[PDB]
């Protein structure tokens, strides 16, 4: 009762098992005193007691979970770490009851905010996949990794058996495909999430879990297998998966330099040679414009949509894979998952019908059995296609080379055609670059730095951070001076289109020009569009419009349009 | 009664957050200030999601315990001056109001109630209708209008705060040797400062901030705002003042200074307001006027 053990007295487990030793009153009181003495006293090398600084922020966020690193608990009072690894279900009860004392020392009457606090363990120093688990692991703490395959809804559950409840949710976890050995199927396990941990993860995420490994009787398993076979589950204890002023100043430094637009385009898709216009269009789509709306009868999207007609093997699928790794959020082939992101299509009636609705709208609506509901698309579409068989025909307009309705070609902001042209010098350049890249990739720090800086003019980590910063912070606008010239150019282009008997230029093209100019302003972190932005946007759209036409019309257009496609 | 902005309407959290005194005491224009407020409510034992509930519907127990909770906690934040006594009125079953809340409702109704000479005449005529929109609210039979006044007061303080943070974070205050100068060249909507009372509310925000930010240099301050229709700056000259808790009064000397520069100057200017500390001047003439002003010994 009154007397307490020394820490050295705990070195000898005196009962027949660990659990029956931890649960004794004098041992338990000793452990409680020692844990409280650790939590009030552990330090950085700089002093600066970390847990006194964490409890402080627990109340600043009105939170419920205190987080403890295992390495700190192993760095002093090692026996408590050993007992925690062996008997988590007991040790964590004592530790939670100590954590409440420590928090009330900062914030008296915190019990009125939350009645009970949970300790979360981090950095447990050994890991298993779902292969290595065996019966010896039962009731031990484990650390596991995988992909979350399926998730239930959240429900309340009765806490005690006057009443009290807690939140509950189950998650199915599967081995990551990179970990699975060759020629074997992946394994599965199911995880239980309680009060603070529900909806911490989403289906398809790759996730890391710490918790107790636990089992129970199940009648159906016994009945079907015909042997006394128990079922097992994991009870999670913790689950795992911005910028400074220095980054902002660095971004602004590079943006202040001349030619930053060209350098960003050059950094785009380093492994692919040539095809600068495709890289330009992809960069413009990833940065995008600004959305606008006028409740008097009109709305304008900020997203930029691009379509690429590809000869066989002209790098299309590689740049889509590159964009998939570059972009913040994306879908590859579902438009709900592409919300405020980029959507990627590499090959191609109901699918096309869905895309017809998606290009007309920015939000999707559906009804079924009298139910009615709505969803958001709000995304930029990058698509590629094979031109109606083995090879494109340049003598014909674009419609002859595609399996698309006319409004699709109207509503795509940018159209482009890529062809396997014949040139000895280009072939030699391609072949030299290809074998050079092949050698540079061979499995057989300084080597990496040289390789990286030869690969690109911008480090791509900085470029991804820069794209995210620009997308979240920069919102450009037009300047009202040169817009008279834009209107005159629009009228001139329409007059020339009619004069040669071309299909006419339209308001959609003018809108696309303004949107692309906004994107060009965003690329250099400029809140103003400028004359050169309008010039570049005009060149892109005019050249794209010219590429869609028949050959005789193409010659008349380029002869007249020389003062836009090349001059300004 | 508490020097908290409209306590018995909106919520307890908003009462602290928009208080003109609290902003000077805890520096709420930045996150290192806002976190102090979260920290306070956590120590006081009030769950933060209840502090944001509408004060009428907030739980009865907190309502009656609040008077003791403040005695135990405001000292640790240097914030004891919040406590004071005031007058409260109630009529039948429709609930209490204090005089401090009432005057904010009336002033809000004055501010926002609903070539160059004609536009100035239209504006000055619109401002006179609000006198009757406030006069008719002094009648117990017309509480409906008073509630509208309160709804307008909240939006006015919101818009003021969202301009004050921009002034401080971009460091637009220019620290001249004799006085402090600030000029608003642009804003989210700069029209709200075209009325004198709104301009004085913004000035009174900045003055508390300047009074508490350093112990040194109690200085006069000048504040100005441009108008795109007149191309004239509306200018006001403001005194310092001593903190709440601390002995003759000081006097506003901008009157004689503006009068003397007006008597001397080439500049195109207007002086017709009852409060002579407020003047108006055309766009190009602001800098020579202020140059002659700072060159003068009258400041």
């Amino acid at each position: 009762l009154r007397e307490e053990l020394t820490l050295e007295s705990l070195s000898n487990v005196k009962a027949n098992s660990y659990s029956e030793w931890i649960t004794q009153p004098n041992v338990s009181r000793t452990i409680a005193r020692e844990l409280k003495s650790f939590l009030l006293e552990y330090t950085d090398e700089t002093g600066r007691s970390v847990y006194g600084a964490r409890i402080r922020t627990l109340g600043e966020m009105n939170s419920e979970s205190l987080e403890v690193n295992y390495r700190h608990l192993a760095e002093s009072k090692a026996i408590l770490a050993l007992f925690l690894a062996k008997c988590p279900e007991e040790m964590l009860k004592i530790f939670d009851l100590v954590a409440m004392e420590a928090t009330e020392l900062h914030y008296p009457d915190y019990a009125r905010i939350h009645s009970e606090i949970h300790v979360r363990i981090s950095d447990f120093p050994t890991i298993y996949s779902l292969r290595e688990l065996r019966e010896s692991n039962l009731s031990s703490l484990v650390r596991v990794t995988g992909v979350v395959t399926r998730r239930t809804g959240v429900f309340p559950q009765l806490k005690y058996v006057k009443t009290v409840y807690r939140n509950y949710q189950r998650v199915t976890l599967q081995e990551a495909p990179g970990t699975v050995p060759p020629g074997r199927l992946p394994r599965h396990r199911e995880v239980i999430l309680l009060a603070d941990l529900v909806d911490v993860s989403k289906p398809g995420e790759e996730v890391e879990v710490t918790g107790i490994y636990k089992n129970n009787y199940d009648g159906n398993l016994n009945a079907k297998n015909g042997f006394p076979v128990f079922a097992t589950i994991i009870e999670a204890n913790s689950i795992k998966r911005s910028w400074t002023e220095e980054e902002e100043r660095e971004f602004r430094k590079i943006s202040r330099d001349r030619g930053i637009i060209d350098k960003i385009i050059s950094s785009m898709a380093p492994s692919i040679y040539g095809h600068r216009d495709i890289k330009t269009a992809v960069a413009c789509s990833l940065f995008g414009g600004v959305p606008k709306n006028v409740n008097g009868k009109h709305s304008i999207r900020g997203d930029i949509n691009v379509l690429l007609l590809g000869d066989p093997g002209t790098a299309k699928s590689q740049i889509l894979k590159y964009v998939e790794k570059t972009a913040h959020r994306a879908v590859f082939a579902a438009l709900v998952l592409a919300d405020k992101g980029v959507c990627l299509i590499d090959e191609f009636d109901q699918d096309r019908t869905s895309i017809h609705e998606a290009m007309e709208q920015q939000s999707i609506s559906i009804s079924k059995a009298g139910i009615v509901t709505t969803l958001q698309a709000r995304c930029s579409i990058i698509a590629a296609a094979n031109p109606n068989g083995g090879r494109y025909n340049s003598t014909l307009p674009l419609a002859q080379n595609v399996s698309l309705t006319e409004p699709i070609l109207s509503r795509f902001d940018i159209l482009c055609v890529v062809r396997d042209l014949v040139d000895e010098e280009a072939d030699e350049r391609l072949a030299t670059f290809v074998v050079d890249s092949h050698v540079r990739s061979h499995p057989e720090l300084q080597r990496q730095r040289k390789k990286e800086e030869e690969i690109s003019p911008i480090p791509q980590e900085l470029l991804m951070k820069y794209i995210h910063y620009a997308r979240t912070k920069i919102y450009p606008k037009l300047h009202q001076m040169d817009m008279d010239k834009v209107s005159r150019v629009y009228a001139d282009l329409r007059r020339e289109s009619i004069s040669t008997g071309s299909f006419p230029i339209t308001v959609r093209h003018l809108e696309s020009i303004l949107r692309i100019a906004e994107s060009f302003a965003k690329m250099r972190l400029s809140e103003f569009v400028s004359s050169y932005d309008l010039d570049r946007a005009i060149k892109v759209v005019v050249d794209s419009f010219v590429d869609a036409q028949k050959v005789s019309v193409r010659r008349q257009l380029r002869r007249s349009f020389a003062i836009y496609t090349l001059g300004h | 009664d508490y020097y908290l902005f409209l306590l018995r309407h909106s919520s307890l959290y908003d009462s602290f957050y928009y208080s003109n005194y609290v902003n000077a005491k805890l520096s709420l224009w930045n996150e290192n200030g806002k976190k102090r407020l979260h920290k306070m409510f956590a120590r006081m034992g009030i769950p933060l999601s209840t502090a944001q509930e509408t004060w009428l519907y907030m739980d009865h127990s907190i309502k009656r315990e609040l008077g003791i909770i403040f005695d135990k906690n405001l000292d640790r934040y240097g914030l004891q001056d919040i406590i004071r006594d005031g007058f409260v009125r109630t009529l039948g079953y429709r609930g209490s109001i204090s005089a401090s809340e009432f005057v904010e409702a009336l002033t809000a109704l004055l501010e926002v109630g609903n070539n160059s000479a004609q536009k100035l005449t239209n504006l000055r005529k619109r401002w006179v209708s609000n006198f009757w929109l406030s006069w008719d609210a002094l009648d117990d039979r017309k509480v409906e209008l008073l509630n509208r006044g309160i709804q307008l007061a909240q939006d006015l303080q919101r818009a003021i705060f969202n301009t004050g943070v921009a002034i401080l974070e971009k460091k637009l205050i220019k620290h001249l040797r004799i006085y402090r100068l600030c000029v608003l060249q642009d804003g989210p909507d700069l029209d709200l400062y075209r009325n004198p009372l709104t301009l004085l509310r913004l000035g009174n925000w900045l003055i508390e901030c300047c009074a508490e930010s350093e112990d040194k240099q109690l200085l006069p301050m000048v504040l100005a705002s441009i108008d795109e229709n007149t191309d004239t700056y509306l200018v006001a000259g403001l005194t310092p003042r001593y903190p709440r808790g601390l002995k003759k009064p000081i006097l506003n000397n901008f009157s004689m200074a503006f009068q003397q520069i007006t008597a001397e100057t080439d500049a195109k200017v207007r002086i017709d307001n009852f409060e002579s500390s407020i003047i108006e001047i055309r766009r190009e003439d602001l800098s020579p006027f202020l140059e002659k002003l700072t060159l003068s010994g009258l400041l």
Partner: peptide, 17 residues
Amino acid sequence: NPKSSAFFESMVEDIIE
């Protein structure tokens, strides 16, 4: 107690700052 002073210092810095 001197060893636990760093904890109480982190608590008191809320008073100071």
